[PDB]
From Swiss-Prot:
Venom protein that mimics the incretin hormone glucagon-like peptide 1 (GLP-1). It stimulates insulin synthesis and secretion, protects against beta-cell apoptosis in response to different insults, and promotes beta-cell proliferation. It also promotes satiety, reduces food intake, reduces fat deposition, reduces body weight and inhibits gastric emptying. Interacts with GLP-1 receptor (GLP1R). Induces hypotension that is mediated by relaxation of cardiac smooth muscle. It is found in: Secreted. Expressed by the venom gland. Belongs to the glucagon family. This is Exendin-4. The modification Serine amide is found at S25.
Length: 25
């Protein structure tokens, strides 16, 4: 694991792609 996946899963928590943001990978 790693932050940016953590963050990403946080991205995902934000909707992932539905966040409006691209995945932090």
């Amino acid at each position: 694991e790693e932050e940016a996946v953590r963050l990403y899963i946080q991205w995902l928590k934000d909707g992932g792609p539905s966040s409006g943001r691209p995945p932090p990978s």
